[PDB]
RNA sequence: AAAAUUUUAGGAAUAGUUAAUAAUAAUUUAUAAUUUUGAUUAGAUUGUUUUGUUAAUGCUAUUAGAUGGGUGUGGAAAAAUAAAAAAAA
């Protein structure tokens, strides 16, 4: 409605699209706003076989007879760790390994730095709920060298998709206040040799050929022989 | 369970609140029906409205008629008053003394210099217009508001006589405002509303009274029915309360 | 054979005008507005509704045949009392406005001069109250729930509540033109007039009013200096009619007005306007018998002025001789720049000088013709994040962008440019993208979208 | 916005009209109660049922139908909510404030609005009981607030009321208060069955006017 | 429908549906093509 | 959002959508078969006609031999014939200004008329499906596009207002001596 | 969607469907979430041109009665740190509260504390901010805050009083959006600056010879990806733009 | 084809060239009335069946149709059929409500020829100027109460004669003698 | 004020109410006391609500809940029906019981 | 929201009930409402472009499909097998 796919036009119910608008398109119900989503069921998922001759104890057995020895529970705990970093790593497993939890530091997604995608995320501040690999994380989105005015909360900050990189730099006490990072238009001079624009609104990518010789290979104009 | 599942008087839509606000936003809550109560039941008359330059200046004189001695009007009035004081004797102030009790036939603003031109101009043009008009016997039963509560009168019903009437006046209406220009509170091609003013309060008197006369007093006598009068006597009254303890009256002519 | 009302009447004017018509303004007239009347002291002023709307008596209702009986709701039945308000003079002024725009002075002279008599001499009618069906009587609502200003985190939304983008257009500031005095009225005639001057200029020289399009824009045409004589001897004969009167109203609209037609018209600088902004205001302060404390020039006078200082630097981009560009004949920019920067000093001193996006497009245009290379700074920090914007920004700016000195710089600066444009909701226009498309053997910047090439091949 | 001054200025010229006879009432009608639709509509006092074409004399309004809003709490199946409920008077042009008070008290009809003393206040000032609607230049538009005595207790958890889904609800308060009226414990028709809006409603954040993700 | 092919991200879990519409960066650029004539 | 969805007949947000232009016919031998061209909701009930907007033709596919006009040496007139009856006005109106929806059949039908171009679903599987790269596509923009103002012109007459004043008809149509 | 007509279907005493009104609490960070951008903007106002009530001279001072008549919705610069009295004073140490003053600390003043102070009575509150140091952004000679100084002793604070759990709107900060421009860039062609001689002007693009540095050469993203972002309605980044503009998803 | 015999057909599916596509509906079936109940004891107080019952309106014989053509459609142009009635009112016990009998007419095309029936209506007047045999004029209107969808328009003859009754405090009009018929015998003297 | 508005479609009392005329036929003891009992509503309840606001706010309760239990929450043309056993007669012996008759009124 | 059209051979009373008030009243106010111009119960019956016969005002057919509420979702309840409606590449 606001904002159509290619205008309205509509010669096939999947010329629209998937969703008409990005607007939820029953106002009884918000939460279909369209976002950019994240495969939460492979992305949680955690490796169970990593887990093959343990012998964890849980949280409230605290039992003389139940508990182990201290090398069976040093090589649990290790099991444990290499359980839950098993997909990939969650922010809030990141988090806590830098210094002052990380604050000031740009915590890019996997796919946001492939492509002529770029994106990332300044943590602005954290809070670590008693669980650990949850909690809340805010902080500013820079895409494609332009920055967000104030804070916000990161999104899908518990599914574990997540790198980033110290720098001391970076970092901001707790005393202190995590800055925005400079949109590079307009605080900044705009520079070629700092930064150089990965694409651009009407642009889009070449094509590359091993794609190419694929599809003519499936739509049977290039042959492929059994 | 006693009765249709949404009463159909409780179906209201109020449009003078914007679109979609009772939907989403918030809801509106109203007690709709004090607004929607209709004219005959509040008891409000609408009068000929005044211009705004001539609602400013105060009324001098007006024409009346003049109810005889030995009225079934003057008498029933006395037994209302009877009754309204042993109810509440807050009324007192507001009441009309019985004396003063005549029929406003319309009102209208002398300026005091022009006056005597005026007065001799009027009552000749009055004299005129009732030349061939006979007695009017006129039936008075009900009662109504004017100025928003503030003033109580007893209606002059459309059934009689009351039809020369509207013509005889529209005729005055027609001279006196019409051809020597003189302030009318309104138009003068609009006929004015005569009644029997019975209770009334004064801009002074309205403080410690109140901004309204409780409907709770007249509710009753709302419909009562006053009677038949016939009436041979038109006058133009200036309003001064102390000269001869009735209206001081300016000019006078007979029906007959 | 709908007898049309005084309202109408207007609207058809405005059309024939606008038109420059002057063969239908002249049988409208004939036919409709003819006995229309202006208002004196033994007038009453507005009309009292005297329509008996109607109905049947029992007789009517019985023994009439069934179309005497039939109401549909007629507009000849009400049209004495749509005109009960008096709008007259507005008829009047259209008129005199055809009979400019048609080329005919006598018949002008005669409309404008009734005119001009009875808005001094006779009372100034009462204005009727806003229709209730043109315009919609605002209903009640409360503005909480409200995306906030800063709802989206990326820029400055709009809301229902406030403005915060601020005004992309400069208003004049002046209530509908039936609720002004008489004298007000005999003002705004005249500045109505100047404004019909001027439309029919741009009719018959198209070429030379539109900005920068052909080298023809910066000199003046001829049949310009009879078009300025008959403007000055119609201003010269405002203050001639009206008196010290003139010291109590408000002649802001018809300044921006004047200074728009020396600007267009006759063409002159910047600081011409300036110059001949202040004589006129110390003229107006110097009629009326007082101590001064002259008005300032309000936003829109400037909005001209500024719009002055553009046109005096512009450019005829891209000749076919691929030489860059073409400038005014003794062109400084030194100079202009010099102008220009302490009338910005002035209008910014000037608390009650309300921005628009407009304004600010003329002096960076300004900036642009000037080759300050500074036409960004200004742009980002005074425009970008707390305006609205055209795509016209963006056009002189890319003029800009191309005369820095490597390429590198020249591209990075227009792919920013575009950024700003999807982040900004400026829907990048199709005269900027050819713009950029036109070097793209040198800066590789694709203006499309795959789609559109798609379909358009 | 344009329409009050363009309105109030019209009327305001009107007034200082020297010469006007007064309208015709014969030719003033004034409104229907009888007109096709089930619903009973009512409208602005300058507009009707029909249709009439012709701009009638701007009157000065003597009954301006103020809204007043308040802060209620209402009961959905996940726990409390926070919304906003608005009670419309007639107040005569003239009155005073106090009286607004009254005349506000005497029309809500809900149990749960008016149980301690409010002040009336316009963008966070408190209204002087004391003066006329006529010096704060209050108009049917003008947006006006109602505070009550505990509200600006409500960020805490007592005065706030106690959700039977994160608290205890005992033979204290089963016996008082919207808790008794409520019937917490299920019946076969469900007791007084309130509204409801689930708890991943608006998300993992709650309603606001910022986008916070 | 919404075609999904065997090479999309599979889904491990016995709770719900086996394949989740993930694409293959190849997959895209295909859909990308085919939608790009469909434009035409 | 039926609770029970009905399962054999499904359809994209809530009956009666969108109006969609079906071929539709009872279902008998196909010796006697003919459908017919209808503007219609999206969900249907039992019977076809609650939800009928307008009724644009009947089709019958049979190819017939020509026996109303004379045998006619000519060698394609004596191919044989298909005959349909499209409701044009309707057809337009309801297409164009109310912006309806297009099944596939009905699609081919109306291509072969003239009235549209063959659909999407119409396949020479000779051909392929292009390919297209961005570069390529911009080289051959650059090399033909036409000024901005014909273009716009064009745009003007082909969806706004067509049928415009020559100088000719104003100078008729403005009043002349007695009024002029 | 569009907001319906009129509601005739519940009764409008049990107020059915509605969308909670906001209330902002001043215990939580969420405040600062509303309050921040705001001061921000007015700040940046004050460097440009006057405002009236922005600048006072000394603390305002009010009796009781007139205590919640008169101050609600005031916003008043002061010079020094003085904390109004019978305010009981809250430090605001807690770091999700300061992250939202972030970008008015950067590009603007400082911002060297800020305090929660509320009354007594418990009724009234006053958000206190205390910047240090003068401006990052250039201060006009004719505008407010040229009568400060704190700005251009180095410490001046900003006091705003509002009631507690109220609407964002009756803390009023929606009045300061007028925009005024920043005059530092053009002071330099000012008929005042000494500097305007070292102005050069380019009138004509100069002779290029090199064409831009070509892009490096395309990667095809490794991952699996959502689908179509156009499809999906998901704007550029799931960020900003126009869901018809593509460009900078993946592909 | 419906106009071709029983051994002219040859396909069921479809008309050749033209005409009208006829389903037959069996018109001759034969149906008959079952008899479930005894002579004596039928279970009904006022009417009893016992034979086949005609069902439908309008398709029941002899037609009876609606005739919009009458004194009421004469006078008026009425919106919608039924918008204006004109009738006498009949009863004032409520308040704000007059009753009115009107009168309608129906057509029997097997004859040729015209009844009037008549119904009772209830009336919205506000203000209470209808007195019992008056001479009213009608309207459709907003649904007022639970039967009220119409108010009285207009007065074409008021009761001069009831008026004048009344206010002398007597009755508008003598209450009828006699109320409903009876099937018993009312012995009831002096 | 006998006749109607034809193009304004107000009744005759809507006349006579503007041109402040009065036709009223002589009222019984019923209708007046009637009309006096019901004139006084508004005066009876400020002085209920201002007086004594408990006894209110326990009635108010009753109602505001009674709003949710009951037959139907929400206005509906099934709930809307002014005359429900009438235009669902079908209900009546089986579903429906509150009901003996279809008709109650003339129509 | 209404107006018209409404069946039984032998015919009597019907009822959470009318109208005013109002977001009232399991006990508000009243000389209430439906009916012999055929009611309400009760039988039969799927209602106002469809057939057959016939020269013809007639006689004689026309299926089928809307069966209350009880956390009330949804734009609209039409929501618990029984398609022959292509349902977001
Ligand atoms: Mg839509
Ligand atoms: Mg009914
Ligand atoms: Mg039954
Ligand atoms: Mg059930």
């Known amino acids: 409605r606001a904002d159509p796919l290619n205008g309205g036009s509509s010669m096939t119910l999947g010329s629209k699209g998937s969703k008409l608008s990005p607007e939820p398109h029953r106002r009884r119900m918000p939460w279909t706003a369209a976002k950019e ?46 359980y839950n970093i098993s997909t990939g790593k969650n922010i809030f497993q990141l988090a806590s390994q830098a210094t002052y939890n990380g604050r000031g530091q740009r915590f890019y997604r996997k796919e946001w730095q492939e492509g002529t995608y770029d994106k990332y995320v300044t943590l602005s501040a954290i809070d670590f ?45 707790f005393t202190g206040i995590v800055p925005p990072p400079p949109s590079i238009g307009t605080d900044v001079p705009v520079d070629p040799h700092s930064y150089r624009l990965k694409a651009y609104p009407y642009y889009d990518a070449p094509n590359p050929p091993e794609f190419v010789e694929r599809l003519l290979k499936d739509r049977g104009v290039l042959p492929d022989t059994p | 369970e006693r009765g249709l599942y949404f009463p159909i008087n409780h179906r209201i839509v109020d449009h003078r609140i914007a679109p979609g606000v009772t939907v989403e936003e918030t809801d509106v809550q109203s007690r709709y029906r004090r607004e929607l109560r209709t004219n005959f039941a509040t008891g409000e008359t609408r009068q000929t409205i005044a211009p705004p330059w001539s609602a400013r200046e105060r009324p001098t004189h007006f024409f009346s008629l003049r109810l005889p001695s030995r009225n079934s009007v003057t008498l029933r009035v006395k037994e209302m008053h009877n009754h309204l004081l042993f109810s509440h004797q807050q009324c007192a102030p507001m009441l009309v003394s019985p004396t003063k009790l005549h029929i406003t036939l319309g009102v209208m603003t002398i300026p005091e210099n022009s006056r005597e031109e005026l007065v001799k101009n009027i009552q000749q043009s009055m004299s005129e217009t009732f030349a061939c008009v006979q007695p009017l016997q006129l039936r008075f039963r009900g009662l109504g508001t004017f100025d928003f509560g503030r003033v109580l009168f007893i209606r002059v019903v459309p059934e009689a006589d009351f039809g020369r009437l509207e013509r005889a006046v529209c005729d005055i209406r027609r001279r006196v405002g019409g051809v020597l220009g003189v302030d009318l509170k309104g138009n003068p091609h609009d006929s004015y509303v005569p009644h029997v003013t019975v209770a009334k309060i004064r801009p002074n008197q309205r403080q410690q009274l109140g901004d309204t006369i409780p409907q709770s007093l007249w509710a009753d006598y709302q419909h009562h029915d006053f009677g038949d009068v016939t009436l041979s006597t038109v006058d133009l009254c200036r309003m001064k309360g102390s000269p001869d303890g009735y209206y001081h009256t300016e000019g006078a002519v007979h029906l007959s | ?253 018809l300044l921006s007005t004047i200074l728009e037609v020396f600007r267009v018209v006759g063409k002159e600088s910047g600081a011409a306007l300036l110059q001949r902004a202040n004589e006129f205001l110390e003229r107006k302060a110097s009629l009326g018998d007082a101590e001064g404390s002259r008005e300032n020039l309000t936003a829109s006078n400037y909005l001209q002025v500024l719009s002055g200082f553009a046109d005096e630097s512009a450019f005829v981009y891209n000749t076919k001789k691929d030489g860059t560009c073409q400038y005014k004949t003794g062109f400084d920019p030194r100079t202009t720049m010099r102008h220009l920067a302490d009338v910005v000093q002035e209008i910014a001193g000037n608390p009650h000088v309300t921005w628009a996006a407009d304004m600010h497009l003329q002096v960076v245009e300004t900036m642009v013709g000037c080759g300050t290379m500074k036409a960004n700074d200004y742009f980002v920090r005074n425009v970008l994040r707390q305006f609205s914007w055209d795509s016209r920004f963006l056009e002189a700016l890319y003029v800009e962008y191309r005369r820095q000195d490597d390429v590198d710089m020249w591209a990075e600066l227009t792919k920013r440019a575009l950024v700003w444009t999807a982040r900004y909701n400026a829907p990048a226009s199709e005269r900027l993208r050819r713009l950029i498309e036109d070097d793209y053997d040198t800066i590789r910047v694709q203006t499309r979208t795959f789609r559109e090439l798609a379909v358009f091949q | 916005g344009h329409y009050q001054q363009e309105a109030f200025e019209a009327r305001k010229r009107f007034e200082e009209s020297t010469t006007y006879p007064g309208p015709i009432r014969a030719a003033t009608p004034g409104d229907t109660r009888f007109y096709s639709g089930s619903l009973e509509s009512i409208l602005h006092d300058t507009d009707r049922h029909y249709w009439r074409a012709v701009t009638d004399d701007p009157r000065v309004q003597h009954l301006i139908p103020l809204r007043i809003r308040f802060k209620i709490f209402t009961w959905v199946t996940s726990g409390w909510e926070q919304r906003m409920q608005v009670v419309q008077i007639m107040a005569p042009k003239d009155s005073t404030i106090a009286q607004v008070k009254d005349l506000v008290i005497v029309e809500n009809q809900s149990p749960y609005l008016c149980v301690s003393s409010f002040h009336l206040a316009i963008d966070g000032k408190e209204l002087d009981p004391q003066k006329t609607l006529g010096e704060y230049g209050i108009t049917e538009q003008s947006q006006i607030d109602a505070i009550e005595q505990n509200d600006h207790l409500l960020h805490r958890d007592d005065e706030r009321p106690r959700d039977w889904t994160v608290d205890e609800i005992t033979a204290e308060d089963v016996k008082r208060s919207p808790y008794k009226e409520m019937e917490m414990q299920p019946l076969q028709n469900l007791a007084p069955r309130y509204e409801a809006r689930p708890k991943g409603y608006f998300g993992r954040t709650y309603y606001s006017g910022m986008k916070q993700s | 429908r919404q075609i999904r092919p065997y090479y999309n991200l599979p889904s491990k879990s016995e709770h719900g549906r086996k394949m989740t519409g993930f694409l293959t960066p190849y997959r895209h650029w295909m859909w990308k093509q085919n939608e790009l004539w469909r434009n035409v | 959002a039926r609770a029970v969805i009905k399962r054999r007949s499904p359809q994209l947000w809530g009956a009666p959508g969108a109006p969609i232009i079906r071929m539709r016919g009872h279902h008998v031998v196909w010796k006697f078969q003919s459908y017919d061209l209808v503007v219609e909701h999206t969900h249907k009930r039992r019977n076809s006609d609650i939800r009928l907007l307008h009724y644009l033709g009947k089709h019958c596919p049979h190819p017939q031999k020509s026996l109303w006009s004379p045998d006619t040496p000519v060698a394609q007139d004596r191919h044989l014939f298909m005959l349909t009856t499209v409701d044009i006005d309707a057809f337009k109106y309801w297409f164009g200004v109310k912006r309806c929806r297009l099944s596939m059949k009905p699609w081919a039908l109306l291509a072969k008329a003239g009235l549209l171009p063959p659909s999407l679903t119409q396949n020479s599987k000779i051909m392929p499906k292009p390919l297209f790269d961005k570069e390529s596509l911009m080289r051959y923009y650059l090399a033909n596009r036409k000024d901005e103002d014909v273009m716009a012109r064009e745009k003007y007459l082909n969806y706004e207002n067509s049928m415009v004043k020559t100088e000719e008809e104003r100078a008729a149509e403005r009043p002349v001596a007695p009024y002029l | 969607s569009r907001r319906f007509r009129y509601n005739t279907k519940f009764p409008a005493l049990v107020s059915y469907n509605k969308l909670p009104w906001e209330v902002v609490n001043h215990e939580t960070p969420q405040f600062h979430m509303h309050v921040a951008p705001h001061y921000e903007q007015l700040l940046t106002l004050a460097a440009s041109s006057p405002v009236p009530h922005i600048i006072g001279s000394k603390h305002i001072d009010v009796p009781r009665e007139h205590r919640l008549r008169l101050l609600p919705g005031m916003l008043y610069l002061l010079d020094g740190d003085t904390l109004p009295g019978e305010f009981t004073i809250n430090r605001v140490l807690d770091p999700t509260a300061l992250q939202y003053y972030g970008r008015l600390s950067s590009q603007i003043v400082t911002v060297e504390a800020v305090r929660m102070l509320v009354p007594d009575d418990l009724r009234l509150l006053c958000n206190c901010i205390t910047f240090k140091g003068p401006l990052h952004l250039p201060v006009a000679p004719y505008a407010s805050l040229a009568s400060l100084r704190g700005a251009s002793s180095n410490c001046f604070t900003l006091y705003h009083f509002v009631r507690p759990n109220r609407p964002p709107k009756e803390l009023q900060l929606e009045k300061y959006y007028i925009h005024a421009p920043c005059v530092a860039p053009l002071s330099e062609f000012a008929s005042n600056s000494d500097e305007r001689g070292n102005w050069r002007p380019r009138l004509q693009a100069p002779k290029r010879t090199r064409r831009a540095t070509p892009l490096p050469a395309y990667r095809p993203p490794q991952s699996y990806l959502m689908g179509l972002a156009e499809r999906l309605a998901v704007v550029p980044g799931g960020c900003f733009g126009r869901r018809s503009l593509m460009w900078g998803h993946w592909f | 084809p419906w106009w071709n015999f029983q051994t002219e057909h040859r396909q069921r599916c479809v008309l050749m060239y033209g005409g009208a596509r006829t389903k037959n509906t069996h018109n001759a079936n034969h149906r008959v009335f079952i008899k479930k109940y005894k002579r004596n004891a039928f279970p009904n107080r006022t009417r009893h069946h016992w034979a086949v019952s005609m069902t439908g309106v309008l398709s029941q014989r002899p037609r009876r149709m609606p005739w919009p053509y009458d004194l009421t459609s004469l006078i008026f142009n009425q919106p919608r059929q039924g918008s204006d009635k004109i009738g006498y009112v009949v009863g004032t016990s409520m308040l704000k409500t007059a009753v009115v009998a009107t009168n309608h007419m129906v057509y029997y095309p097997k004859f040729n020829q015209r009844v009037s029936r008549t119904k009772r209506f209830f009336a919205h007047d506000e203000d209470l100027a209808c007195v019992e045999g008056d001479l009213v004029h009608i309207k459709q209107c907003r649904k007022i109460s639970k039967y009220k969808h119409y108010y009285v328009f207009s007065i074409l003859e008021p009761n001069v004669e009831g008026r004048e009754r009344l206010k002398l405090g007597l009755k508008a009009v003598p209450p009828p003698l006699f109320g409903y018929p009876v099937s018993r015998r009312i012995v009831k003297l002096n | 004020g006998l006749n109607g508005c034809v193009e304004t479609g107000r009744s005759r009392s809507e006349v006579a109410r503007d041109l402040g005329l009065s036709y009223t036929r002589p009222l019984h003891e019923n209708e007046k006391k009637q009309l006096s009992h019901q004139a006084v509503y508004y005066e009876r309840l400020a002085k209920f609500k201002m007086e004594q606001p408990e006894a209110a706010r326990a009635m108010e309760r009753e109602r505001f809940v009674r709003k949710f239990s009951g037959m139907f929450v929400k206005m509906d043309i099934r709930s809307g029906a002014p005359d429900f056993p009438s235009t669902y007669r079908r209900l009546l012996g089986t579903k429906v019981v509150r009901w003996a008759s279809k008709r109650h009124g003339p129509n």
């Open chain 1, 37 to 82: 989503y994240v495969p939460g069921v492979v992305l949680n998922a955690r490796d169970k076989m990593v887990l093959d001759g343990v012998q964890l104890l849980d949280i409230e057995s605290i039992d003389r007879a139940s508990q182990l020895d201290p090398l069976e529970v040093l090589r649990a705990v290790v099991a444990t760790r290499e």
């Open chain 1, 129 to 173: 709920d008693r669980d650990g690999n949850k909690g809340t994380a805010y902080g500013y989105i820079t895409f494609h060298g332009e920055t967000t005015t104030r804070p916000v909360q990161v999104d899908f900050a518990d599914v574990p998709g997540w790198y980033m990189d110290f720098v001391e730099e970076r970092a901001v006490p």
């Open chain 3, 1 to 253: 054979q709908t007898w049309p009302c005084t309202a109408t009447i207007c609207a058809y004017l405005d059309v024939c005008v606008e038109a420059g018509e002057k063969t239908w303004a002249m049988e409208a007239w004939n036919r409709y507005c003819t006995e229309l009347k202006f208002l004196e002291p033994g007038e009453v002023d507005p009309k009292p509704i005297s329509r008996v709307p109607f109905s049947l008596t029992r007789e009517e209702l019985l023994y009439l045949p069934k179309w005497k009986k039939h109401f549909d709701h007629d507009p000849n039945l009400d049209v004495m009392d749509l005109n009960r308000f008096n709008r007259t003079r507005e008829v009047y002024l259209r008129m005199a406005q055809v009979m400019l725009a048609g080329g005919e002075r006598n018949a002008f002279q005669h409309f404008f001069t009734k005119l001009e008599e009875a808005m001094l001499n006779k009372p100034t009618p009462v204005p009727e109250p806003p229709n209730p069906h043109l315009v919609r009587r605002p209903r009640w609502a409360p503005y909480e729930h409200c995306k906030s200003v800063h709802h989206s985190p990326w820029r400055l939304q709009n809301n229902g509540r406030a403005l915060a983008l601020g005004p992309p257009v400069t208003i004049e500031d002046e209530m509908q033109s039936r609720f002004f005095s008489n004298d007000q009225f005999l003002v705004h005639s005249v500045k109505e007039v100047l404004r019909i001057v001027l439309q029919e200029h741009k009719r018959a020289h198209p070429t030379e009013c539109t900005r920068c399009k052909t080298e023809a824009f910066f000199y003046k045409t001829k049949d310009a200096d009879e078009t300025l004589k008959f403007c000055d001897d119609l201003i010269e004969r405002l203050f001639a009619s009206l008196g010290v009167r003139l010291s109590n109203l408000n002649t802001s609209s």
